[PDB]
Amino acid sequence: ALRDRVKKLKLLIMDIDGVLTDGKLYYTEHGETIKVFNVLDGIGIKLLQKMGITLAVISGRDSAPLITRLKELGVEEIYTGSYKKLEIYEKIKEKYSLKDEEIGFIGDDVVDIEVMKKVGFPVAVRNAVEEVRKVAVYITQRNGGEGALREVAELIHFLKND
Amino acid sequence: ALRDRVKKLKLLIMDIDGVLTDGKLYYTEHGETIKVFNVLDGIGIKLLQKMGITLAVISGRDSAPLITRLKELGVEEIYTGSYKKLEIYEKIKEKYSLKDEEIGFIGDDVVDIEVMKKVGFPVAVRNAVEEVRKVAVYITQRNGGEGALREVAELIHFLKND
Amino acid sequence: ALRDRVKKLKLLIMDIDGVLTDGKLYYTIKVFNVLDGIGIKLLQKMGITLAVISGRDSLITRLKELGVEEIYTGKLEIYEKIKEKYSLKDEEIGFIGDDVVDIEVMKKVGFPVAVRNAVEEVRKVAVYITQRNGGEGALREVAELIHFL
Amino acid sequence: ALRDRVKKLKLLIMDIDGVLTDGKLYYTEETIKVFNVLDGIGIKLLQKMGITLAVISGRDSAPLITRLKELGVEEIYTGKKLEIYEKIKEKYSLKDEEIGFIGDDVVDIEVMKKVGFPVAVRNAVEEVRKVAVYITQRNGGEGALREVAELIHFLK
Amino acid sequence: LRDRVKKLKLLIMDIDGVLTDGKLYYTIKVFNVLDGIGIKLLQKMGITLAVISGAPLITRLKELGVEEIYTGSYKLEIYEKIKEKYSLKDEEIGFIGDDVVDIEVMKKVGFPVAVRNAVEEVRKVAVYITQRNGGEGALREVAELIHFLKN
Amino acid sequence: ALRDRVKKLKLLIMDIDGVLTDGKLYYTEHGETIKVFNVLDGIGIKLLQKMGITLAVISGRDSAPLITRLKELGVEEIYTGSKLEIYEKIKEKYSLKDEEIGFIGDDVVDIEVMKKVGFPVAVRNAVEEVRKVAVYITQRNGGEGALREVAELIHFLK
Amino acid sequence: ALRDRVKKLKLLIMDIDGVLTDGKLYYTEHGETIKVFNVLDGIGIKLLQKMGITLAVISGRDSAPLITRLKELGVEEIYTGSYKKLEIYEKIKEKYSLKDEEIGFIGDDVVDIEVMKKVGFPVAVRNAVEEVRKVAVYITQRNGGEGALREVAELIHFLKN
Amino acid sequence: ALRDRVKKLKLLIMDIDGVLTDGKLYYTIKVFNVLDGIGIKLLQKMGITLAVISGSAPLITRLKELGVEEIYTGSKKLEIYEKIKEKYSLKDEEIGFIGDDVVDIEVMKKVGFPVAVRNAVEEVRKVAVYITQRNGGEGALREVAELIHFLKN
């Protein structure tokens, strides 16, 4: 049933903090001015785009380094600022004309539980709370910021071509 | 025991270095210009505010990044500078008309010991020195900056509602 | 958090193989752990029903002797049998495992436990991973965490 | 910090299960006795250092305790911890700061919170471990008591 | 890892430090029952089992259906004739070891596995490192990984 | 044979991210403006040069802090934004054979060069496909002082 | 005789990289512009100052953030940019009118070995190479960025009285 | 310089209890690690003299049968160390010690190849150039022997 969920995947939505990051927030005088990412996740992102999967971002936080990083990777569909994830998710569905089953989500915190409950490919990072790991169909062995996304890309590569 | 200690709680005091941070100090040419926090602690902070638990900070180190983070999280009760912890503790008590039993302290270093010996809910981070740990009613599973504050918020949430 | 799930807990299922046992057969002078016997007593005194879904049809005698209720030897269909017999929800059930065939039942229950040296696949489905390896007294550790929480 | 606690130490209370053993029982179709040789050396080492030795365990153990009594351990309590602690404390007229405790049980936690030198075994549940000032490298039954004896001696 | 496991048709292993912790109880033999269950799963899966060792566990192993048993050498020359024998490529074979003598053979095979407490030299040449220490059921672990990553 | 491979070595090529770094990318509004290195690797760089090994860099990523660090250590052959193409240009410039060159990698896009090269090195964290082509794998994960460890190895075998 | 060595201690010298820092180096366009310390080490220094022990630093590397931190800490003798440690060790020893037995040294590097062989209180950090740990009289539990100097300060305070 | 330390090594000294055993005594049977036996054979084949310092009867017989004759019992290890050093005419750098105990530390400080076992007290792990992955009597001696052999060339 995992392979089926994966073979049908058309759009992968990502959380940022705790997923592409280790959860640390780098602050100077004017807010979150630095964000630390992982190099392997960047190769994973490009691998996912090469295979025809649209990548979306829903992050409760906004950041100039994040936007810069996302734009550099050619990411698309960016929602920052709002923790209203389910309402944003439904905007993504509507504009891409997609079903729940052809969408994925990689989450970390309680905020993402209700999106992952509808989504066909719900993914929890290793360091995610018990509450999102129970709702996940795949749990990464790598923590957020350690190449967790590269891992999901490689699972997707195998199962799509299997 | 523990359930009742936490039901009496209306205010939580916290240190920064070693509690909201891992204890590292990021120096630029002009001093401590960068300060690194944990995204889990920001969620736990707002959860405690929502539950009716006022947050206070007593810390000898002040930082522009610290000020920006705390303001963003709505932590308005902030005492920085070279103060004896007990002096500030009594300013807070007087201001909010609170007893020892209505207050919590999450500490780290020996400078916190006498206040922790007075409060209804004294908490220590896992990395806190044993002198602080012995005076604590609850010791966190997580080190400072790993998400110890969310742990204390979750524990308080469970204990109050049961 | 652990405390929410331990609070609903009424029924705990286990594996034996790699959980109550390290797997070692001594030859037959083979024998087992006393901490787990004291953990079993503690769970039965706490009003928690004990069950076992083992892959190997073996030492059910030690379990019978310690007072273990449900015994299945030689899986989702079996788990569903226990759920209806005791009229419980998923949230009220726990499962201590170390096997990949345990994973799907572990995803369902409210208190899934993995032993320390279980495969990562099993460990990431668990709410609690034990500090003991299984055979080393994992069941005592679980019962004592339940009592504490 | 650790050297300050060790300095005041005059009595070390210990558990049996999970500290002196790994919990395993061995049966010949009879019982194979298991005692760690390093723990006996640890016991003699602690005695030579003037540290009184005591045992508080819920479970009685006939094969150990026989060994411990042979090795010279006399303060033995089997079968309500923190009632028994107060008895040994008063009997030897000591302060909390002067007692150490080696535990592998949640029933030890309240006693370990009081004592000057609380010790937890490596694979003990985190609840126990976070209350101890020292956590051993060795498991129960692999020579944990000897490691505690080694440490006290090094810190003096 | 999911790729390597699909091609797998033969799995070679050490005995000592892998199926055992190396302990000798003195006329007492210790064998891990979990490893017996792992052997049968591998056999159900169509994977041929072999050992290259450099001894009392042999009679139980043969009884459990283990074919190629080589004992007392110290491993590339023996690996090479296992390969010739079954007409297999490197990518179709796996190896479970804990000794530096296994390294050269592990470098060739498609699925090299090291046990938890193996020398770092052995572990760095492994595609997978077991959570079990050996004598704890590390062969059950490898069997169940292959199954999981397959189906 | 490793002693023999080491004895031929005259030029070592390096990847950066996952080799001299732990994979982390530090970003501000204007991109990767902060880059974190290890003091041990700096010692390793110098130690390798004192043994007469030319050092070269072929990285896919470009960064100001990277070139600052690389120039500071006296690394001359720097190639950013890029691998087999660049590999031949270096081989040609220094009139070397495949057997006289080394490569320390982490990523899959290093394999191609690592199969040609005489001293292919994988860092501990390196992907399995990379680790399998390597004749030496470091204990250090990269950012942990992997280059110092490569220097010690070469020093001993020479 | 660890008590004996510490009782003679009047001055304590220390490396930076791998002792006050985890050996990591934060680079920007203009070199090492960020440096990470540990807060526990701050309390360690104030404790040694209270004790009346003079603090020296000898570091191979130099950075703007390094100086700023050491100046804020009130560190008396700051040598930076030099790898000739015996030479400046002899400068510090002369300046303070002291014997080898009155000086301590916490090292990480092989360059420290020769100065540590002279000093009365030679200290290695946990992560230090065997060549250095071998010469030391105390090896710390904590690594470089983890409060290794706090550990040494508390140790000194315990052995002193 | 770990490969430097191994290269000079001519004599390896060890404890028995905690290094060749977990310390457990089975009472009414003896426990030896067979990998340590092979480890012993490899060390011998590489011209490394094996010595033991202990403070015991069951395992000594086995060691004697495998080729270990430099055996010390009933010990305070510095003075017997100087003896082995004198007897074999070696410097500190040519000797190795695999330790488990705080008593070993002074000797380990001096020797060229100090080894600690995985579960040794940290004080003993502090003074080792190598910490083994095996605990106890898991095959720790063999692990040291493999390492010396690998690090040769």
PDB file of N, CA, C and O in Angstrom, chain C residues 46-96:
ATOM      1  N   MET C  46      -2.041  -3.522  38.686  1.00  0.00           N
ATOM      2  CA  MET C  46      -2.490  -2.220  38.194  1.00  0.00           C
ATOM      3  C   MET C  46      -3.810  -2.310  37.413  1.00  0.00           C
ATOM      4  O   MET C  46      -4.338  -1.296  36.967  1.00  0.00           O
ATOM      5  N   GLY C  47      -4.336  -3.525  37.259  1.00  0.00           N
ATOM      6  CA  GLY C  47      -5.593  -3.756  36.549  1.00  0.00           C
ATOM      7  C   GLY C  47      -5.459  -3.701  35.043  1.00  0.00           C
ATOM      8  O   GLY C  47      -6.437  -3.439  34.329  1.00  0.00           O
ATOM      9  N   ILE C  48      -4.242  -3.929  34.556  1.00  0.00           N
ATOM     10  CA  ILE C  48      -3.968  -4.023  33.122  1.00  0.00           C
ATOM     11  C   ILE C  48      -3.961  -5.501  32.706  1.00  0.00           C
ATOM     12  O   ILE C  48      -3.254  -6.322  33.293  1.00  0.00           O
ATOM     13  N   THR C  49      -4.772  -5.814  31.698  1.00  0.00           N
ATOM     14  CA  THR C  49      -4.871  -7.145  31.122  1.00  0.00           C
ATOM     15  C   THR C  49      -3.651  -7.385  30.241  1.00  0.00           C
ATOM     16  O   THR C  49      -3.213  -6.481  29.527  1.00  0.00           O
ATOM     17  N   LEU C  50      -3.101  -8.597  30.306  1.00  0.00           N
ATOM     18  CA  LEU C  50      -1.903  -8.940  29.543  1.00  0.00           C
ATOM     19  C   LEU C  50      -2.195  -9.971  28.459  1.00  0.00           C
ATOM     20  O   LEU C  50      -2.923 -10.937  28.681  1.00  0.00           O
ATOM     21  N   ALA C  51      -1.635  -9.725  27.278  1.00  0.00           N
ATOM     22  CA  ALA C  51      -1.826 -10.579  26.114  1.00  0.00           C
ATOM     23  C   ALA C  51      -0.490 -10.875  25.432  1.00  0.00           C
ATOM     24  O   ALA C  51       0.505 -10.173  25.656  1.00  0.00           O
ATOM     25  N   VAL C  52      -0.474 -11.920  24.605  1.00  0.00           N
ATOM     26  CA  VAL C  52       0.714 -12.276  23.833  1.00  0.00           C
ATOM     27  C   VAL C  52       0.386 -12.827  22.438  1.00  0.00           C
ATOM     28  O   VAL C  52      -0.448 -13.720  22.272  1.00  0.00           O
ATOM     29  N   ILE C  53       1.038 -12.241  21.440  1.00  0.00           N
ATOM     30  CA  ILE C  53       0.898 -12.650  20.049  1.00  0.00           C
ATOM     31  C   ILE C  53       2.299 -12.973  19.564  1.00  0.00           C
ATOM     32  O   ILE C  53       3.022 -12.086  19.109  1.00  0.00           O
ATOM     33  N   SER C  54       2.680 -14.242  19.710  1.00  0.00           N
ATOM     34  CA  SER C  54       4.011 -14.721  19.348  1.00  0.00           C
ATOM     35  C   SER C  54       3.985 -15.417  17.993  1.00  0.00           C
ATOM     36  O   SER C  54       3.011 -16.110  17.660  1.00  0.00           O
ATOM     37  N   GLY C  55       5.053 -15.220  17.216  1.00  0.00           N
ATOM     38  CA  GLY C  55       5.227 -15.900  15.932  1.00  0.00           C
ATOM     39  C   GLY C  55       5.636 -17.359  16.095  1.00  0.00           C
ATOM     40  O   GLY C  55       5.189 -18.231  15.352  1.00  0.00           O
ATOM     41  N   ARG C  56       6.498 -17.617  17.072  1.00  0.00           N
ATOM     42  CA  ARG C  56       6.959 -18.972  17.350  1.00  0.00           C
ATOM     43  C   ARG C  56       5.988 -19.691  18.283  1.00  0.00           C
ATOM     44  O   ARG C  56       5.561 -19.135  19.303  1.00  0.00           O
ATOM     45  N   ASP C  57       5.631 -20.919  17.912  1.00  0.00           N
ATOM     46  CA  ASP C  57       4.784 -21.776  18.731  1.00  0.00           C
ATOM     47  C   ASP C  57       5.692 -22.623  19.617  1.00  0.00           C
ATOM     48  O   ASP C  57       6.023 -23.770  19.276  1.00  0.00           O
ATOM     49  N   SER C  58       6.107 -22.041  20.745  1.00  0.00           N
ATOM     50  CA  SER C  58       7.100 -22.655  21.644  1.00  0.00           C
ATOM     51  C   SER C  58       6.502 -23.517  22.764  1.00  0.00           C
ATOM     52  O   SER C  58       5.286 -23.707  22.849  1.00  0.00           O
ATOM     53  N   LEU C  59       7.557 -22.574  26.601  1.00  0.00           N
ATOM     54  CA  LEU C  59       7.742 -21.288  27.271  1.00  0.00           C
ATOM     55  C   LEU C  59       6.465 -20.425  27.277  1.00  0.00           C
ATOM     56  O   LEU C  59       6.476 -19.279  27.734  1.00  0.00           O
ATOM     57  N   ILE C  60       5.364 -20.975  26.770  1.00  0.00           N
ATOM     58  CA  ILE C  60       4.052 -20.410  27.059  1.00  0.00           C
ATOM     59  C   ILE C  60       3.735 -20.742  28.517  1.00  0.00           C
ATOM     60  O   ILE C  60       2.933 -20.065  29.157  1.00  0.00           O
ATOM     61  N   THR C  61       4.393 -21.791  29.015  1.00  0.00           N
ATOM     62  CA  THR C  61       4.261 -22.299  30.384  1.00  0.00           C
ATOM     63  C   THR C  61       4.707 -21.285  31.437  1.00  0.00           C
ATOM     64  O   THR C  61       4.063 -21.146  32.472  1.00  0.00           O
ATOM     65  N   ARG C  62       5.809 -20.587  31.167  1.00  0.00           N
ATOM     66  CA  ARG C  62       6.289 -19.523  32.048  1.00  0.00           C
ATOM     67  C   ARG C  62       5.271 -18.380  32.116  1.00  0.00           C
ATOM     68  O   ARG C  62       5.044 -17.800  33.180  1.00  0.00           O
ATOM     69  N   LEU C  63       4.666 -18.079  30.969  1.00  0.00           N
ATOM     70  CA  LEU C  63       3.650 -17.043  30.850  1.00  0.00           C
ATOM     71  C   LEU C  63       2.343 -17.452  31.551  1.00  0.00           C
ATOM     72  O   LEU C  63       1.820 -16.692  32.370  1.00  0.00           O
ATOM     73  N   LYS C  64       1.834 -18.648  31.233  1.00  0.00           N
ATOM     74  CA  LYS C  64       0.719 -19.273  31.968  1.00  0.00           C
ATOM     75  C   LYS C  64       0.970 -19.205  33.472  1.00  0.00           C
ATOM     76  O   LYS C  64       0.111 -18.769  34.231  1.00  0.00           O
ATOM     77  N   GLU C  65       2.165 -19.633  33.875  1.00  0.00           N
ATOM     78  CA  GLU C  65       2.599 -19.671  35.272  1.00  0.00           C
ATOM     79  C   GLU C  65       2.625 -18.298  35.956  1.00  0.00           C
ATOM     80  O   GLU C  65       2.367 -18.189  37.163  1.00  0.00           O
ATOM     81  N   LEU C  66       2.965 -17.264  35.193  1.00  0.00           N
ATOM     82  CA  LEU C  66       2.997 -15.900  35.718  1.00  0.00           C
ATOM     83  C   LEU C  66       1.612 -15.250  35.672  1.00  0.00           C
ATOM     84  O   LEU C  66       1.390 -14.198  36.271  1.00  0.00           O
ATOM     85  N   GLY C  67       0.688 -15.889  34.961  1.00  0.00           N
ATOM     86  CA  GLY C  67      -0.712 -15.494  34.972  1.00  0.00           C
ATOM     87  C   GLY C  67      -1.190 -14.751  33.750  1.00  0.00           C
ATOM     88  O   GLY C  67      -2.214 -14.071  33.811  1.00  0.00           O
ATOM     89  N   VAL C  68      -0.464 -14.885  32.640  1.00  0.00           N
ATOM     90  CA  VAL C  68      -0.823 -14.209  31.387  1.00  0.00           C
ATOM     91  C   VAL C  68      -2.131 -14.748  30.797  1.00  0.00           C
ATOM     92  O   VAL C  68      -2.318 -15.962  30.654  1.00  0.00           O
ATOM     93  N   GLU C  69      -3.018 -13.814  30.462  1.00  0.00           N
ATOM     94  CA  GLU C  69      -4.384 -14.105  30.049  1.00  0.00           C
ATOM     95  C   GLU C  69      -4.524 -14.623  28.600  1.00  0.00           C
ATOM     96  O   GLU C  69      -4.673 -15.832  28.384  1.00  0.00           O
ATOM     97  N   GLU C  70      -4.472 -13.718  27.622  1.00  0.00           N
ATOM     98  CA  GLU C  70      -4.607 -14.086  26.219  1.00  0.00           C
ATOM     99  C   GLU C  70      -3.295 -14.597  25.657  1.00  0.00           C
ATOM    100  O   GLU C  70      -2.272 -13.925  25.763  1.00  0.00           O
ATOM    101  N   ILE C  71      -3.316 -15.784  25.060  1.00  0.00           N
ATOM    102  CA  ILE C  71      -2.109 -16.319  24.432  1.00  0.00           C
ATOM    103  C   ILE C  71      -2.381 -16.820  23.021  1.00  0.00           C
ATOM    104  O   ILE C  71      -3.167 -17.748  22.811  1.00  0.00           O
ATOM    105  N   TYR C  72      -1.726 -16.183  22.060  1.00  0.00           N
ATOM    106  CA  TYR C  72      -1.802 -16.581  20.667  1.00  0.00           C
ATOM    107  C   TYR C  72      -0.394 -16.890  20.193  1.00  0.00           C
ATOM    108  O   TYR C  72       0.509 -16.069  20.356  1.00  0.00           O
ATOM    109  N   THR C  73      -0.210 -18.083  19.631  1.00  0.00           N
ATOM    110  CA  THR C  73       1.112 -18.567  19.215  1.00  0.00           C
ATOM    111  C   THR C  73       1.075 -19.260  17.852  1.00  0.00           C
ATOM    112  O   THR C  73       0.063 -19.851  17.471  1.00  0.00           O
ATOM    113  N   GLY C  74       2.188 -19.186  17.123  1.00  0.00           N
ATOM    114  CA  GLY C  74       2.301 -19.793  15.794  1.00  0.00           C
ATOM    115  C   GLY C  74       1.880 -18.872  14.661  1.00  0.00           C
ATOM    116  O   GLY C  74       1.638 -17.680  14.868  1.00  0.00           O
ATOM    117  N   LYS C  75      -0.002  -9.909  14.492  1.00  0.00           N
ATOM    118  CA  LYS C  75      -0.887  -9.983  13.333  1.00  0.00           C
ATOM    119  C   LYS C  75      -2.221  -9.285  13.595  1.00  0.00           C
ATOM    120  O   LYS C  75      -2.758  -9.326  14.707  1.00  0.00           O
ATOM    121  N   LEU C  76      -2.746  -8.659  12.545  1.00  0.00           N
ATOM    122  CA  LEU C  76      -3.891  -7.759  12.625  1.00  0.00           C
ATOM    123  C   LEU C  76      -5.215  -8.449  12.955  1.00  0.00           C
ATOM    124  O   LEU C  76      -6.020  -7.916  13.724  1.00  0.00           O
ATOM    125  N   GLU C  77      -5.440  -9.620  12.357  1.00  0.00           N
ATOM    126  CA  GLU C  77      -6.661 -10.398  12.588  1.00  0.00           C
ATOM    127  C   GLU C  77      -6.778 -10.889  14.031  1.00  0.00           C
ATOM    128  O   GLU C  77      -7.865 -10.858  14.609  1.00  0.00           O
ATOM    129  N   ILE C  78      -5.645 -11.323  14.592  1.00  0.00           N
ATOM    130  CA  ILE C  78      -5.526 -11.741  15.995  1.00  0.00           C
ATOM    131  C   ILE C  78      -5.746 -10.565  16.960  1.00  0.00           C
ATOM    132  O   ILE C  78      -6.485 -10.697  17.934  1.00  0.00           O
ATOM    133  N   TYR C  79      -5.097  -9.429  16.679  1.00  0.00           N
ATOM    134  CA  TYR C  79      -5.273  -8.183  17.438  1.00  0.00           C
ATOM    135  C   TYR C  79      -6.739  -7.733  17.500  1.00  0.00           C
ATOM    136  O   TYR C  79      -7.208  -7.298  18.556  1.00  0.00           O
ATOM    137  N   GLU C  80      -7.443  -7.837  16.368  1.00  0.00           N
ATOM    138  CA  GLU C  80      -8.874  -7.482  16.268  1.00  0.00           C
ATOM    139  C   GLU C  80      -9.770  -8.405  17.095  1.00  0.00           C
ATOM    140  O   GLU C  80     -10.848  -7.994  17.541  1.00  0.00           O
ATOM    141  N   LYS C  81      -9.325  -9.652  17.273  1.00  0.00           N
ATOM    142  CA  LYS C  81     -10.004 -10.625  18.124  1.00  0.00           C
ATOM    143  C   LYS C  81      -9.991 -10.206  19.586  1.00  0.00           C
ATOM    144  O   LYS C  81     -10.996 -10.341  20.280  1.00  0.00           O
ATOM    145  N   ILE C  82      -8.843  -9.703  20.034  1.00  0.00           N
ATOM    146  CA  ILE C  82      -8.634  -9.272  21.409  1.00  0.00           C
ATOM    147  C   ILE C  82      -9.420  -7.995  21.681  1.00  0.00           C
ATOM    148  O   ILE C  82     -10.021  -7.828  22.746  1.00  0.00           O
ATOM    149  N   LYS C  83      -9.423  -7.109  20.694  1.00  0.00           N
ATOM    150  CA  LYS C  83     -10.113  -5.828  20.784  1.00  0.00           C
ATOM    151  C   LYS C  83     -11.620  -6.002  21.000  1.00  0.00           C
ATOM    152  O   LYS C  83     -12.230  -5.269  21.790  1.00  0.00           O
ATOM    153  N   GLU C  84     -12.208  -6.984  20.321  1.00  0.00           N
ATOM    154  CA  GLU C  84     -13.645  -7.242  20.452  1.00  0.00           C
ATOM    155  C   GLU C  84     -14.001  -8.032  21.714  1.00  0.00           C
ATOM    156  O   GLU C  84     -15.022  -7.759  22.350  1.00  0.00           O
ATOM    157  N   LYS C  85     -13.153  -8.995  22.076  1.00  0.00           N
ATOM    158  CA  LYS C  85     -13.332  -9.777  23.298  1.00  0.00           C
ATOM    159  C   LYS C  85     -13.374  -8.896  24.555  1.00  0.00           C
ATOM    160  O   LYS C  85     -14.192  -9.123  25.447  1.00  0.00           O
ATOM    161  N   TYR C  86     -12.495  -7.898  24.620  1.00  0.00           N
ATOM    162  CA  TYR C  86     -12.411  -7.026  25.793  1.00  0.00           C
ATOM    163  C   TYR C  86     -13.136  -5.689  25.623  1.00  0.00           C
ATOM    164  O   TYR C  86     -13.112  -4.839  26.525  1.00  0.00           O
ATOM    165  N   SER C  87     -13.785  -5.519  24.470  1.00  0.00           N
ATOM    166  CA  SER C  87     -14.549  -4.312  24.154  1.00  0.00           C
ATOM    167  C   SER C  87     -13.739  -3.045  24.410  1.00  0.00           C
ATOM    168  O   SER C  87     -14.131  -2.174  25.192  1.00  0.00           O
ATOM    169  N   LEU C  88     -12.595  -2.959  23.741  1.00  0.00           N
ATOM    170  CA  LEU C  88     -11.692  -1.833  23.911  1.00  0.00           C
ATOM    171  C   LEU C  88     -11.476  -1.114  22.605  1.00  0.00           C
ATOM    172  O   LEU C  88     -11.634  -1.700  21.541  1.00  0.00           O
ATOM    173  N   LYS C  89     -11.143   0.169  22.691  1.00  0.00           N
ATOM    174  CA  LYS C  89     -10.678   0.916  21.527  1.00  0.00           C
ATOM    175  C   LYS C  89      -9.159   0.774  21.345  1.00  0.00           C
ATOM    176  O   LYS C  89      -8.455   0.342  22.253  1.00  0.00           O
ATOM    177  N   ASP C  90      -8.679   1.115  20.152  1.00  0.00           N
ATOM    178  CA  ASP C  90      -7.253   1.218  19.859  1.00  0.00           C
ATOM    179  C   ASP C  90      -6.473   1.989  20.927  1.00  0.00           C
ATOM    180  O   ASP C  90      -5.394   1.559  21.327  1.00  0.00           O
ATOM    181  N   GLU C  91      -7.035   3.119  21.368  1.00  0.00           N
ATOM    182  CA  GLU C  91      -6.413   4.046  22.347  1.00  0.00           C
ATOM    183  C   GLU C  91      -6.121   3.434  23.739  1.00  0.00           C
ATOM    184  O   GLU C  91      -5.251   3.905  24.464  1.00  0.00           O
ATOM    185  N   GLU C  92      -6.859   2.382  24.085  1.00  0.00           N
ATOM    186  CA  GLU C  92      -6.758   1.715  25.378  1.00  0.00           C
ATOM    187  C   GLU C  92      -5.786   0.522  25.348  1.00  0.00           C
ATOM    188  O   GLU C  92      -5.565  -0.145  26.369  1.00  0.00           O
ATOM    189  N   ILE C  93      -5.199   0.267  24.179  1.00  0.00           N
ATOM    190  CA  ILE C  93      -4.331  -0.889  24.000  1.00  0.00           C
ATOM    191  C   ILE C  93      -2.880  -0.454  23.773  1.00  0.00           C
ATOM    192  O   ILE C  93      -2.612   0.576  23.155  1.00  0.00           O
ATOM    193  N   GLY C  94      -1.962  -1.248  24.312  1.00  0.00           N
ATOM    194  CA  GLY C  94      -0.541  -1.069  24.094  1.00  0.00           C
ATOM    195  C   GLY C  94       0.042  -2.319  23.469  1.00  0.00           C
ATOM    196  O   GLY C  94      -0.574  -3.382  23.515  1.00  0.00           O
ATOM    197  N   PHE C  95       1.227  -2.182  22.879  1.00  0.00           N
ATOM    198  CA  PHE C  95       1.896  -3.292  22.217  1.00  0.00           C
ATOM    199  C   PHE C  95       3.418  -3.128  22.272  1.00  0.00           C
ATOM    200  O   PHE C  95       3.967  -2.209  21.667  1.00  0.00           O
ATOM    201  N   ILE C  96       4.085  -4.030  22.993  1.00  0.00           N
ATOM    202  CA  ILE C  96       5.549  -4.097  22.993  1.00  0.00           C
ATOM    203  C   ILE C  96       6.093  -5.116  21.974  1.00  0.00           C
ATOM    204  O   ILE C  96       5.818  -6.309  22.061  1.00  0.00           O
TER     205      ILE C  96
END
